[PDB]
Each structure stands twice: as structure tokens, then as C-alpha cells.
Design an enzyme around this catalytic site. Structure first.
Site, short mmCIF file in Angstrom:
data_model
loop_
_atom_site.label_atom_id
_atom_site.label_comp_id
_atom_site.label_asym_id
_atom_site.label_seq_id
_atom_site.Cartn_x
_atom_site.Cartn_y
_atom_site.Cartn_z
N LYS A 101 0.88 -1.17 0.00
CA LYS A 101 0.00 0.00 0.00
C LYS A 101 0.93 1.24 0.00
O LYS A 101 1.28 1.76 1.06
CB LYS A 101 -0.94 -0.02 1.21
CG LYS A 101 -2.19 0.83 1.06
CD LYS A 101 -3.18 0.45 2.18
CE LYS A 101 -4.51 1.13 1.99
NZ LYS A 101 -5.40 0.16 1.29
N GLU A 110 -9.29 -6.85 -8.36
CA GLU A 110 -9.98 -6.09 -7.31
C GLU A 110 -10.58 -4.83 -7.93
O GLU A 110 -10.42 -4.57 -9.13
CB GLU A 110 -9.00 -5.70 -6.18
CG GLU A 110 -7.82 -4.80 -6.63
CD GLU A 110 -6.85 -4.46 -5.48
OE1 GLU A 110 -7.26 -4.50 -4.30
OE2 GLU A 110 -5.65 -4.17 -5.73
C1 LIG Z 1 -6.20 -1.19 -4.01
C2 LIG Z 1 -6.94 -1.47 -2.72
N1 LIG Z 1 -7.48 -2.68 -2.46
C3 LIG Z 1 -8.15 -3.01 -1.34
C4 LIG Z 1 -8.37 -2.10 -0.32
C5 LIG Z 1 -9.15 -2.58 0.90
O1 LIG Z 1 -8.27 -2.89 1.98
P1 LIG Z 1 -8.72 -2.75 3.56
O2 LIG Z 1 -9.95 -3.66 3.60
O3 LIG Z 1 -7.50 -3.22 4.32
O4 LIG Z 1 -9.05 -1.28 3.75
C6 LIG Z 1 -7.84 -0.70 -0.45
C7 LIG Z 1 -8.05 0.39 0.62
N2 LIG Z 1 -9.05 1.39 0.21
C8 LIG Z 1 -8.84 2.67 -0.26
C9 LIG Z 1 -7.68 3.45 -0.04
C10 LIG Z 1 -7.57 4.75 -0.56
C11 LIG Z 1 -8.62 5.31 -1.30
C12 LIG Z 1 -9.78 4.53 -1.51
C13 LIG Z 1 -10.96 5.04 -2.30
O5 LIG Z 1 -11.88 4.24 -2.59
O6 LIG Z 1 -11.00 6.24 -2.66
C14 LIG Z 1 -9.88 3.24 -1.00
C15 LIG Z 1 -7.09 -0.39 -1.71
O7 LIG Z 1 -6.55 0.84 -1.96
#
Ligand SMILES: Cc1ncc(COP(=O)(O)O)c(CNc2cccc(C(=O)O)c2)c1O
Ligand SMILES: Cc1ncc(COP(=O)(O)O)c(CNc2cccc(C(=O)O)c2)c1O
Ligand SMILES: Cc1ncc(COP(=O)(O)O)c(CNc2cccc(C(=O)O)c2)c1O
Ligand SMILES: Cc1ncc(COP(=O)(O)O)c(CNc2cccc(C(=O)O)c2)c1O
Ligand SMILES: Cc1ncc(COP(=O)(O)O)c(CNc2cccc(C(=O)O)c2)c1O
Ligand SMILES: [Cl-]
Ligand SMILES: [Cl-]
Ligand SMILES: [Cl-]
Ligand SMILES: [Cl-]
Ligand SMILES: [Cl-]
Ligand SMILES: [Cl-]
Ligand SMILES: [Cl-]
Ligand SMILES: [Cl-]
Ligand SMILES: [Cl-]
Lengths: 286, 287, 287, 287, 290, 286
Positions: free
Chosen positions: F146, F179
Site C-alpha cells: 500500500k 480487485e
Molecule cells: C487497491 C486497494 N485494495 C483493497 C483495499 C481494501 O483494503 P482494507 O480492507 O485493508 O481497507 C484498499 C483500501 N481502500 C482505499 C484506499 C484509498 C482510497 C480509496 C478510495 O476508494 O477512494 C480506498 C485499496 O486501496
């Protein structure tokens, strides 16, 4: 009767043997060439030796003699066997080391020169099948290296033997036509000739000579990617290599290519190539 | 001093030579195994011989003797050299034919058995590894499941490791997944759970199989699944497995310390269990 | 002397014709199923109809009747032809539109039901197979999970098999993994254990599903995982599965004998169990 | 009112029907062309017929008449309907066989010729395009160079474009390179130079070939080479080419204005030159 | 001491800061260029600005000023710092928005111009040549995160650099998603073999402005040249290899993956191109003060 | 009004700025997390911090404080702003170095903690479109990291914005479903749930929590590769992430998913997940 050059001595064929501990044997860790002698001349000897040294460089192997010395050894071996028309197979091995893979632990690369006399398929043409195995990748075991690792080629040949083809044709890791199990491939369509770039196959010395002829004759020519479709719908297909020279391919995967007979452009190139082999080369005697 | 079995005769090492016209030499057209003898016993002899015959079948090579005969020849070779602790390298070649690649022109595969005595400070400290630029030979081109004499892909990786400061090379496959080391399978340990790649892109290791048996017996959570560069870099522990290496800890990958930079607790436990297994199992050479 | 259901009417075979302007003909824009009737019962009728609707959904085609109605039409067509043992081919087309490829211009999907009587010396000896040069249609291009009227990929593989001495063609996928036969799923048997590819690169076979149920009932170790050329060549047994074929043994692949070259013990056991299943299950045609 | 040539007879449109047992319908096992008649002339008739025979060769289908005969049938069909400006769709099918996919069981290929009258506002403003998630059918699976009845890949892309606000869909290929539109070739204009993909991953367009002749005649720098998403987004102009479309400007791709958002100067020049070509070339229908 | 242009004002280096809520920082959502000033002239300024606007177009970012205005701002920044020999880094960001990734929530892209002095303290810095290693990571795909976009997303390049640092190379060389040679972590790559020069097409790498200038030189000198795919084999067996970029100019590569390239010294063709390129930089460019 | 933690001090939002010479800004060379506070508790704080340190390790970045210290800084920042329901964005940068990409020249990583207050589309569900761009490869720029490199995700979001989708869905370099642009994806078909393995996407903490619920409820579950076909023919589809929680996807590429309304299994999981967020977490106060 026939002598093989092996590390400074001439040795009869039946006695020409290499240690089983040489990495060239254990792991196919070595390089080779295929060269023809025509009427007392060695065709494109220097080009083959340049490629042998490039193959060695690619696998980080130092050939322990100079190119000039290697050329003299080849000429000497032909002389010793009194040959005028021959196939020549120089080989360089990594040498003996321990039973692991580390090439740094190998000492004394072996230098070997094999010379063998050379004395329906071209009138009728060959049948080919495309194989399921892809060619060794240019990012895994580059096919531009002419090494002792030829099992990819052998698997393709086994498929061809079982599937009714005289020759196997490979596609590459990206789905593009590569080459035959032992030769480069050319396609003729509406008077124009195409051949794959050399990255996914081998920079053939016959291929290079045939391209020179094609350009001299003013036939439109392009080095570009080819697919199964281009093979099936071609007016003519042929393969090129040291042993094969120019071989017409008249059936691919059960489909007749054009009229099913060696084509006019192929036949013209076969004539021109014969002419070239009769008039060029390093003289063996005098 | 040491004798090699070669086509029915025992031949001293310095004289153990193969015709340059054998396709095993010209084209690496042959198969091999790597087997260990521990304290007068040959570890997993039958498994290795089964795999030797599978390698041969994959390249359409008929081994001219039975598995039982091959096992006896291996035992005989060890006896002849009076070995109790050894590395064994059986080799079968395509045989002599003409200078083309067609295997139909070859008659009489050669049968060869090499036995060398066997008797790590690198295992207390662990090994450094680097990931290589070359991908592993594809499972749709030159399947790595075949233990053949075509090992140049592995050698190129080893050359990269030598030049790049690694004791071992780690391959990715044609699809970007972790495959294996140049000569061993690879395992990743993360939060008490162990993962290893499926065997399609690598080799069905007999050490790997034995280690998985141990893992399951110990009840360590285990999954066979694809792994990536990220899983290597962020692992608590990494180790590689093979006949010669046994279980070797990997403590640095691409300049990154793995966990604390020392062989890990789970790795050490598996190393102990594996030693125990090698001391108590195997086909007896003498009794 | 047979009737075909075509858009609400029963029509003799010789008159069963579709407009050349139907997109199902111009572009293969439609879906189909293959179903068997055994001894007055339709084997796995509901499963086939579920898959037909899934195929249609995948290509954004709305079938203009309900699943219950479609099942009744199939039963009616079998009744009308007085069949007890039959092959059934339901087809849904996009319908007539203009000469462009846009499906928005098509109005009235056609509904077609073909039923043909069904009454295996190749099964005693087993089939020969060859692996083809063409890869299977990609799951990110023209998903093979869709049983559509686009079967030219399968036909090209069959043409290769015809020219290359095989009874059946075996595909690899865009990533180098084994997919399936030109018209059947593929299973590998090795050391008493069975493997089959995941369904993403092939088709979710109803025969395949039934055979997996049998395998699990018999307690044979089973794993859904990627398989390669190596696994085919070194298998103890190989077989293919489909509605028309049932379970067909594959005894030679790319010139290599599989095991002893005869239909294997596990294959034969599964063939028996599958026959039993077809004799005791299904939607009754009469009463 | 309009007649279709079908196997030796002229048949009214509403009656032009094919047996549902023809493999051309069951499996999309057949080939087709798209040809235009302008002012009593058929544009590039011979080129289209050459390509029709190449498509058939690629799928191992023997067209049962000569190219000269096929050309005469096309001219006759146009005459019969008294057309001067038309779209022509010749089709050759594998023919009727049994319900398996084996083409060896099919006997009598059908020959069909459809001619529809022909004779804009989207060309002054230009079209919007979207790049699709589905990749083009691979040149090593179902070669797109074959103009076959298998057009579901193209239809899936069109469905995506319909749902996603594009007049046209743009494909990438299995290796990540730009291929073509759902029914036309694609060209990019940047700093006075024109690029188009090689034809291996798309179709050897006859319009594309004519436009390249114009480009070279005008001395515009031109290169046949791989193009990526980046080249589409940052282009000065983009256009697509095909028999039905002629030359269509693309002025928005994936929500991004291409250059100034209006059909570009080079595109407009090529559109003029191409109109000129269609008015002065072709096989005359009458006299 | 040195001033940075930031949204209409000149700001000292130590104070040149961007809001942490700018998407350029949160997500690397922005574009940049690398430009050189030689002896009071800005080399290929217009080409760099054209590429900056192409990078922005590729990520659907509207630069809020014209190309002419951007060029003037660059010249002004150099003037303000009294530079004649400098490295220039213009940057455009998406701007401040909320914490989601949607760029529609961003208003006001930031415009930033960094100028740093540049002094080749020694000529013959590339007398020995550089060592390179090929990396395990592939280049970002032209169908995923196109490398033709010079964006603030440079982590792929950084991972390759980390590999090179750990593996004994001065430079990292990438292959692409299809197994073809791409480029170095921050420069284009050229291969010389038997008097002929090859370089990859630009699709899997970046349309380098140095690369373009070197190709002009190559053609002017009549050296046989081809843009075509190259593999590991071509790198290992080359007579000479060199890389090109704004900062590096032309850098010889004399060892790749432990293999000496040719004789292990900068090659004759490379040296000739290095001379010609120096000449070009001394005689061309937009004048800062004239 | 709101304070941001930045390298040891609390700084008002409007003043929270980073040097343009930090490699986190120049090259997106840094890592981040997304964390939720519910009713005075921080949901799965330790899991998020473990992942933050794994992201840093993957890019060879040493976080200059301990995990325990990082957790305390997060709690302190929430306290300082008196928040009970919030979104937390910790960020670690490579730090200031020279203008090249070499991370060896960067010395002092920045530590940043952003906390923002948190408080109809879920009743109706979201529309999604599959994008042309593939996800960053697990052998190029691993998506399991991330990092501040989110332009791949932004390009997908731009496509979705232009193509009528609330969300973008990626395929990977090998043609498999990966995803959404910012969330993991799950498919429901005939009472069973599938989700891709995590190699081509991100090991989501929401995803992990939802899998725990799924297993607790005894819903058949399998982690395996999914294709376009599985998306189009699903009974239900939903996405998971910290910000989104569980979002139903009711249309994909113009196709209604099942009946076009949030499905029964999705709704059940949404309820169970709400329960989990109300009863678990590290307390902010006392
Ligand atoms: C590419 C990706 N995949 C999965 C998740 C979900 O992971 P968690 O269940 O650990 O939160 C994320 C995280 N989600 C994320 C981060 C930054 C921006 C946005 C947006 O939708 O604008 C979303 C993410 O950025
Ligand atoms: C490529 C490869 N992978 C894994 C193994 C391990 O398999 P076993 O667990 O069955 O041994 C092997 C076999 N190991 C092997 C073969 C040849 C040389 C060397 C060496 O370490 O130098 C190692 C191998 O050659
Ligand atoms: C894979 C391959 N490709 C092309 C050629 C042609 O290259 P020249 O034009 O330079 O010869 C070769 C070399 N040809 C070759 C080598 C070894 C065996 C056989 C055989 O036919 O069995 C053929 C080769 O081995
Ligand atoms: C995939 C494809 N690509 C390119 C062309 C252009 O080829 P010519 O320049 O030779 O026409 C075609 C042919 N164009 C074609 C065929 C069938 C339907 C439609 C439609 O737009 O609905 C279009 C095609 O089907
Ligand atoms: C990936 C990449 N490729 C090629 C070039 C050369 O392009 P020009 O010839 O137009 O400069 C660049 C630009 N070079 C660049 C940018 C940022 C940092 C570094 C570094 O080497 O530290 C290098 C680049 O970042
Ligand atoms: Cl390979
Ligand atoms: Cl190409
Ligand atoms: Cl996976
Ligand atoms: Cl495909
Ligand atoms: Cl797998
Ligand atoms: Cl290219
Ligand atoms: Cl990528
Ligand atoms: Cl190429
Ligand atoms: Cl899978």
C-alpha cells in the site's frame, strides 16, 4: 578412419569421449556450431566462429583459444580427414568441476571439432506441423545461444514424429511464429517475403545469406512478426539452415500450402543459394 | 579409487567418459537424479527412481532396465566403493545416433551411476539470495518438472547470483509467480503459517515432499499456493529444500533482511525433524 | 421423421431453418446446451438449463421464456418424437437484426430444441490424443465458460487432431496451463490420486461435476489445480468427460503410451459408477 | 423485393433461410466478406474475394467454386436487384453434417450472397470511443485475421461500448498492444506522422490498405508499429477504417478529448482522398 | 539562497512545501519533467514542455496555464536564481481534494518549478564506464501504468534501483511484461554490435528527449540504426552499450550481469556520440538572458 | 480546528505541508494505511500497523519508530482532535534526499497521521465497469504494497467516471479478476462465495474480517481465480474496504447482477460486519 580434434590431439571417432564430470555433459553447459565445407571451401567460416564466441559470451564461458586459432584447428581437422565436402561441428564445454551447478568451479573448457563427410524431399517438399510446446523464451534460456541445451528442439521433433510432420514449427512465449526445430522460417505471399525478427529464434547464417539474395533480386522483404494465419494462407513457405540449406514446406497442419508443390520463388532462391555455396568460402587446401 | 557404473562395468572416475556422439552430450538429451545415502541407508531411493522414470517418459526415452534392476545397480555401486554416506547421481542418456536432433536415430541409451562420498557453517548464519532477471524454463516449453541434462537455465541464474552477491538465485516463472531456487524448492513462513508454490512451474522435490509430511505431522498451517516477490520480502522466514542442501535458511533477499536476519524458529525445527528422518529411514546398502 | 421445436411450432427436420439475418448465424451470436435422455429420463436437466441461462447472461442475451417453460418445451419435444434415449440441443439466438454487429438492433431471440435418438469400441481400447498448437480462447477475450455458437477455436483444434493422428485434441491456455479437450473436460490419475484443472480456462462441465461427486463418494484423493504437459505425459491414466462422450479413456498423448496403454483401473471404475448414475437419475419424460 | 443468392437460386430476403444443421449456424463454422458498390462499380472486389479464400484456407474449408465464378455471382446478384450503391455480404458455410464439431462429416458448403442498398452526421462531429476490458481473440487461439462467422469477441466489445458511452470499442491484444475497433482498423496521427498496428493482432483491412496507399502517395510520414493506450490518449488525431465505416474520426477516447475534440486536418484530407478513390475505381456491374 | 516557483510566488528551498492533502503527494497524482540549462541556454525546452503536456493529457489532468506561459515561468525561475548551468524540474500536481482517489474532487492543480545548479566538476566522469545489472522486477506495463507517462509514480524505478544497490550495479536494466528489454531505471538504452546500433521501440519505456537527439546524431553520422526489440542475449554479446537521459547525458555501460561488454572500456562509437552530444548542448537552446 | 501529527508536532490542517524535496512527493516513495475509529474504538489497529510495516519492508524503508509507538501516536492524534468516529491515514515517507531516485541519499523518513471525522447507495447498490488497464503486476510494482504510487488505481477510476460506473474492476496481467480501484471483490453464486487469492491485489483487512464472518456463518467459501464470466453470471457481487465497508455491486458492464438489488447474502454480511465494528477495537479514551 575419421579423426576428431579433442583438446590438442586427433582421436578416432570410436575413441572420441568426454569425461562424464564435464559440465557440458552433466548440464549441457557448452556451445556448438554447424558449418559446411563445399568443394574444398568452408562456407561462412568466420561468421560461424563469430557466433560461437557470441554463444560463449552469452553463457559467460571463456573460449581458451583465439578465433584465428579455432579456424586453423577446423581447417586442420578437415585436412587430416582429407575432406572436401563435409559437415563440421565445433563444440566448447565448460569443463570439469564438482557436482553442483557453479560454473566458477570448472576448470579447462574442452575444445572439440567433429568433421563428417557430406554426399525426394526437396523436389516434393516437406510436411510440417506446429507444436504445442513454445520455443525457449528469450528471457529464460535465450534461443539466440546455440548451446548444448537442445531438449526444447527435441521435444518439438518428438511431436512432429508422432504427428506426421517431417518438421516441427514453434510459436514463442507471446504467440508469434519463431522457427523450425532446427531451421529459420520464411513466408512468401503475393510476391513478398516475410521472416520473424531473430530475438525469439536464432540469427541463422543461412537466413542472413538468403536475405542478401532476396535483396539482390529485389524481392520485397520485411522482417516482422508472423502468426499461424500467415503460415496457413501463404503462397510458399520454406526453412533455412546449414544442414538443410533451403527446404520447401508444402503442407502445414494438414493444409496444402499454395498448390502443394515447392514454389517458384523458393526454387529460384534454392538455385541462387547453390551458386553462392559453389563460389564462396575459406579454402581448405593451399 | 572411486568407481562409476557405466553400462554394465565399473570404471574408475578418471576413466569414466561418454562418447561425444551420445545425444546426452550433444543436446543434453538425457535424465538424471540426485540421491543421498545416510549411515548405510539410501534415503527415499524408490521415490527418486520413480521420478527418474517419469523424467524419461516425459522426454519419450525408454530406460532399458527395470526399476528393481536400477535400484540394485545403485546399491552395488555404493558397495563397490564401500560407501555409507554418499551422493548418488544416476544418469540415463538417449544414446549414440547421427548428428541431427531426431531421437529415432539413437540406439542404446547409456546407464550411468556416480557415487561420491559425503561428509554447514552457512546453515548457522543462513544464506543470502537474489531474485534473477531470467525466468524459469516454462512448463509449456521445457517443463522444469523434468530433471533433464538441460540445466543451462539454472546455470544462467547461478551466474547472475555469483555476479550479484547471492549464495542462491530465486526464479520467477513466465507468468510472474515465484518458482524455486536454481537447484532447490522454496518455502515462505509468515505469522506461523507456511506457503510453497504448486509444483507445475518448478520440480516435484522429494525433500519438499518429506518436509510437507513433517509440517502436516507437526500441525503447522500449510498451503500450496502462488507466491510473489512481496511474500519473499515480507516473510518471517524463508528456506530452500533439496537433496544436497537438505533445508537451507535464507536470511537476506535482494538486500533485505528476512525477519531478524537469522535462521528462524520454524526453519530450525524443520531442520531437526528432517535430520531425524534421514537417520532412521532408507533402503539398507549392506544388511 | 423427427420434429424440431422452433419458436412455438413443431417443424420437421428437413424444414427446420433459420433466417440468414439472425445474428446467431451471421456472427455465432447465441448460446446452446448438450443434454442426454437415458431410459425415459433427462439427465441433469435443471443443471443444463441453469448453465444455458448463465451463458446467455454472459453475452447479455435475455431468454424470452422462463426456465420452467424451457424445461417443459424440452420434455414436449422428446414426447412428440417418442424418444427415451436421446441427445438434446437447445439453442437460443440473438435474433434477426441489421447487418451490423450491434445486438441492440436485434429484437426477437429464437428458441430452438433439437432431439436426436441415441443408441463404443473406442472405449475398450481408449483414444489417442494430441496437444494442439492453438491455445484455448482466453477467459479475458472470449470466455470458454460461455457455451456459445462461437466454436471455431474448438474446430481448429479438431482439424489439427484430424491431420496429426489424434482422436481428440488437448488445449493449453493463454498462460501455458492445460485447459480441456476440443469438446470435453480432462482428468489426470497419478499414484491413486486425481487432478483436474480449475474451470476458469475451460467449461464448468456437468459430467465433470458428476464425476467429481463420484470421486469424493469413493474417497479417491482429488485436487482441482493447474496441470501441465508434464502431468499429461507421466500420468498413470487420463480421461475426458462430456455429455456425448460420457467418460472416455485417453491411452496415448503425443505419441507417448499413458501407463500401460490401456484404459486404467480407476477410469474403468468411474465409467461403471457413472453408468449407474445415468440409469437411476433424471427428470422423467413420460408421466 | 430484394433477392439473396443461395446455392444457385435467387430467393427473397424473407425466405432466405439456412438449415439449423449447417455447421455455419451450430458453430459459426464459415467465412464472410463485406464489400461496397459505389455508382455501379464494386470497390476492390478482387481483394475481398482473395481475402474470402484466405479466410477459408485458414479454417481448412474448400470453397466449391472458383474466384471468377464467385465474382460473377456477386455481380449477378447486384444486377438482379438493380443496385448501383450497395453493401455486399458473401458467406461460405462448412455445410450440413452431424451434431459433433468434426468438419470431416460436413459435405456441401453453402454459398450465400446478400446485397442491401446503401444511401454521416457523426462524421462532421466525430465518434466517441472507449477501450474495452476484453482483449482481442489471440493470433495463437482464434486468429482475428480470419473473417469468420465467430464474431462474439467483437460483439462483447460492442456490448461494453453500448454500456459505457462509446460509439466504438477499442481492443488491446493478449500482449497489451492496441489491436483495432470492434469492426474497423485504427490509425493514430501525432506531429504530422501516422502510425497503425501491424496486422497480426487484428485484420488485414482492405480500407486500411487503400488508406496506406493514399498516405504514401501524399508523402505523410507513416510507420506500421505497436501502439499503446498512451499513444491513443495523447494523439493529435485518431481514426478508424472499414468497408461500412469508410474513414471515421475518433474525437474522444475514455473521456479524454483527442487534440481539439474535432475531426483533424489529416483525417479530413484522407476522407476526401478516399471518397475520390471510391468514385473512380471498381469492377463495373453493368455493361 | 535558491528560490522555487510555487503557484505564482518565488519561495526559498527550505520553505518550498506542498499540502499533504494534494493528490500529487497522497497518490503520486501528478507529472514532471527533467530539463538542463547549458551556458545560459535551456536545451530542448519546447520538447520537454510538449512531453509534460502529453503526460498530463495521459492522466486526464488539465494544466491550468499555456505552454508559452510555462516556458516563461521556467526562464524566470532560472533568472531569479541567476543560473546559467542548471537542472530544472517542473512539476504539475492534481491539487487538493478529499482523502479518496477520485480526481473529480480536486481543484487547483499546483505548478512548481525547481532549479538547481549543475557543475560538471570534472570532464571524463565516464572514463571508466558504469556497471549494470538486469533486475527481477519488470517495467510497469504499457497496459497498466504506461511508462511513457513521466508521472510522480516512480516506485517501479526505485525498486529496480534498490535491486541495483544490493546487487553491485551502478544502474538497473528492466525487461518488460513480454520479456523484451525496456530501459534503465532512469534512462533509455542503446546496443552497438558490428558497427550497427539498436534501441527498443518507445512503447515499453519513455520517449526520451536525449534518446531522440542521439538518434539525430546517429543518422547524421550515417551509422546503421534500427528501432527494434532487444533481449538479454543482445545486451550480453554487444560490442558496446550505453544509456541516455537528461541528467546522465550519454553514459557507457561496460559490465552487465558480471559480463565485460566488449573490451570492458567505453567503446569507440559511444565516445564519438558523447563528443557530438557535448557539441549539440553547447550550440543549441532557448537563451535565458538574450 | 483539526490537527495533523507531523514528525513529533501537532499542526493545523491548513498548515500541514511536506517539503517538495521529500521523495514521498517527488516519486510517491512512501507507504500509507487507511483505518476507521467506531464509537471511540480503532477497528483492527494492530492489523493495519502490521501491514504498514510490511509495506515499508517491501520497499526497503525503515520506519524510525516502533509499532507500539506508532499506535500511541495514532491514539494521541484522535484524542487531540476529540474524535470518536473517524478515518485515520498514517503515512511514512522516504524523506528528503537529492533529486535522483536513489533511496540511499534519503535520511529522515517523515511520519504523518491524518484523522478526519466520519459520519442511500448501499440500499440500491453500486454500478461497476471493468477497465481496460490491468492492475500493476505482482512482478513489477506489487499491489500488496500500500504505497503512495496510486496512479494505476486513479487511471481505473478515471475510466469508471467516464464510462458510467461508480466503481472500476481490474483484471490482472494474466487475465484474472484482481480487485476494485480501492477495495477487494467477492462473488456469490448458488449460496457459495469466491474471492481472488491476494497475490494480484491487496491483503485487505476488511476482506480478512469478512472471511471470518463467512466461515462463522458456515457459508461455503473458496479463495480461487475468478474471470469476467464469474462476475457477469454471479447471484451477488460485493466489494470490501476500510472506507466502503461492504458495498453491493448490482450492475457490471451494463448487466444486472441477479435481480439488480443488493442480495440476501451481501445484506447478511453487511449486518454481521456492523456488529463486529460496534464490539471490537482498541479504545481511544481511558
Ligand atoms: C487497491 C486497494 N485494495 C483493497 C483495499 C481494501 O483494503 P482494507 O480492507 O485493508 O481497507 C484498499 C483500501 N481502500 C482505499 C484506499 C484509498 C482510497 C480509496 C478510495 O476508494 O477512494 C480506498 C485499496 O486501496
Ligand atoms: C531445479 C531443481 N529444483 C529442485 C530440486 C530439489 O529436488 P529434490 O528435493 O528431489 O532433490 C532439484 C534437485 N537438486 C539439484 C540438482 C542438481 C544440482 C543441484 C545443486 O544444488 O547444485 C541440486 C533441482 O535440480
Ligand atoms: C534452432 C535453430 N534454428 C536455426 C538454425 C539455422 O542456423 P544456420 O543457418 O546458421 O545453420 C539452427 C542450426 N541448425 C541445426 C543445428 C543442429 C541440428 C539441426 C537438425 O536439423 O537436426 C539443425 C538451429 O539449431
Ligand atoms: C474486426 C474487423 N476489423 C477490420 C475490418 C475492416 O476491414 P475492411 O477494411 O476490409 O472492411 C472489419 C470489417 N468490418 C466489419 C465487418 C462486419 C461488421 C462490421 C460492423 O461494423 O458491424 C464491420 C472487421 O470485422
Ligand atoms: C524512466 C526514465 N526513462 C528515460 C528517461 C530519459 O528521458 P530524457 O532523455 O527525456 O531525460 C528518464 C528521465 N530521467 C530521470 C528522471 C528522474 C530521475 C532520474 C535519475 O536517473 O535519477 C532520471 C526516466 O525517468
Ligand atoms: Cl521458456
Ligand atoms: Cl508485431
Ligand atoms: Cl494465484
Ligand atoms: Cl484468446
Ligand atoms: Cl498453479
Ligand atoms: Cl513493439
Ligand atoms: Cl505492470
Ligand atoms: Cl520483435
Ligand atoms: Cl486458476
Amino acid at each position: 578412419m575419421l579423426y576428431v580434434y579433442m583438446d590438442g590431439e586427433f582421436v578416432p571417432e570410436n575413441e572420441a569421449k568426454v569425461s562424464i564430470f564435464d559440465h557440458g555433459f552433466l548440464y549441457g553447459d557448452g556451445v556448438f556450431e554447424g558449418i559446411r565445407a563445399y568443394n574444398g571451401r568452408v562456407f561462412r567460416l568466420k561468421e560461424h566462429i563469430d557466433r560461437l564466441y557470441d554463444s560463449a559470451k552469452a553463457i559467460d564461458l571463456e573460449i581458451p583459444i583465439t578465433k584465428e586459432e579455432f579456424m586453423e584447428i577446423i581447417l586442420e581437422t578437415l585436412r587430416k580427414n582429407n575432406l572436401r565436402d563435409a559437415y563440421i561441428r565445433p563444440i566448447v564445454t565448460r569443463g570439469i568441476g564438482d557436482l553442483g551447478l557453479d560454473p566458477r568451479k570448472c576448470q579447462n573448457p574442452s575444445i572439440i571439432v567433429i568433421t563428417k563427410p557430406w554426399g525426394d524431399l526437396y523436389e516434393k517438399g516437406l510436411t510440417a506441423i506446429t507444436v504445442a510446446v513454445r520455443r525457449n523464451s528469450f528471457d529464460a534460456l535465450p534461443p539466440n545461444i546455440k548451446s548444448l541445451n537442445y531438449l526444447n528442439n527435441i521435444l518439438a521433433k518428438i511431436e512432429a514424429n508422432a504427428k506426421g510432420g517431417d518438421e516441427a514449427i514453434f510459436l514463442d512465449r507471446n504467440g508469434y511464429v519463431s522457427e523450425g526445430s532446427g531451421d529459420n522460417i520464411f513466408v512468401v505471399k503475393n510476391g513478398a517475403i516475410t521472416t520473424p525478427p531473430t530475438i525469439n529464434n536464432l540469427r541463422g547464417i543461412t537466413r542472413e545469406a538468403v536475405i542478401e539474395i532476396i535483396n539482390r533480386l529485389g524481392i520485397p522483404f520485411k522482417e516482422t512478426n508472423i502468426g499461424l494465419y500467415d503460415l496457413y494462407t501463404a503462397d510458399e513457405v520454406f526453412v533455412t539452415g546449414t544442414a538443410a540449406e533451403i527446404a520447401p514446406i508444402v503442407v502445414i497442419d494438414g493444409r496444402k500450402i499454395g498448390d502443394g508443390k515447392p514454389g517458384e520463388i523458393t526454387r529460384k532462391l534454392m538455385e541462387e543459394f547453390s551458386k553462392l555455396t559453389e563460389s564462396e568460402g575459406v579454402p581448405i587446401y593451399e
